[PDB]
C-alpha cells in the first residue's frame, strides 16, 4: 500500500502520501472572516515561497549530483530498513531516536539523499533546514564506526558546509527569514487545523 | 639495478583543492604511495603555495 | 521567602557550540524560563567570548 | 609505579570529537594526562 517512510518529507507538490513513527507534514488543505483571509494568503505567499523552493533545488542540485554520485556508502543506513518496518505496527522508538537492545548505540540515520526529495516537495524555508540535513550527515558520521569513516563523512559533511556557505547569502537570508516568520505562523496555524478538523 | 630509486613529481597548488581538507588526502595517498617502494622520495615543487606566512589573518 | 530571584547562570559559549542551531534553541528556552518565573537574572560569565569583536 | 600517568600527544588544529575522545578517554584512567602541542593553531 502506501510507503514505509519514517522522514518526515511532505510539501506541496507532493510526497504526502505517507506514514511515519514520529511528527509528519502531511500538507494539502489537512472567526471566519480571518480563517477565510488567512486562506487567501496562505494560497498567494505559498505558491510564491513554492517557487522560491523550486529555485532554491536548482541551485542545490549543481552540488547535490557531485556529493551523491562521489559516495554511496552513505547513501544507506547501516541498519537495514526491515528492523524499523515491524515497529510502524531489538529496536524500540524512543521521542524519535531508535534504540538497539545488543549495544546500545543512538542512529539518526538517512540514506544521503533525504534532501533532494524533500525539496522535491519543498518545506525549506530557510537555508538553515539544509543547514539541519548537512548536520545530520554529521550525525550520521558520529553514531555509528570507527575513526576513519567518521573523519572521511566529516570530510564530505564540510565539502557540503563549505557549498552551504555559499547557498548562505545574506540577501537570501533576509528573505528567508521573512518568510520563516511566515512558516512559523503558517505551521502554527497548520497544528492548530489538523487538531481542530 | 639493484633498488630502483623512485620521483614523486608534485606541484604547489594542485594539491591545495576545492573541499575542506582533502588536500590532506591528496598527500595522504602520496604518503602511502611512499611505503610502497622503500626507495622513494617527494618532491614538493612550490612548497609555498602550501605553507606561506602567517600575515595578518 | 515567598518571591524567588532565580538565577541561571551560563558560561563562555557554553550556548555557543559549532553548530548553528543549538545556540538559538538554547537560547530560547533560556529566555522562555525567564518569562515563566518571573523574578530572574541571568548571568553570562566571559561575554567577551560568548559575544566576541 | 603503582599509578602511571598516561601520555596523550596532541597537535594543533572535526576536532570537538577528537576533543571529546581525548578528554573522556583521560577520565577512565584517572592517572593520565593532557598534552596539546602548538595551542596557537587551536586558540588565535
Redesign the interface.
Known sequence: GPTRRLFPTGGPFGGNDVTTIFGKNTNFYNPLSEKVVLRRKLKSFQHQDMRLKNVLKIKLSGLMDLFKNRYKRFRKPPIDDAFLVHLFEAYIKDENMILEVSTGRKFFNMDLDIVEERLWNGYYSEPKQFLKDIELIYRDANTIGDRERVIKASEMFANAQMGIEEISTPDFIQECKATRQRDLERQELFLEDEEKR | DERKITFFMRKGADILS?????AE?QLRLLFEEAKKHQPSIIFFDEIDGLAPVRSSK
Open positions: 576545492k573541499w575542506v581538507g582533502e588526502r
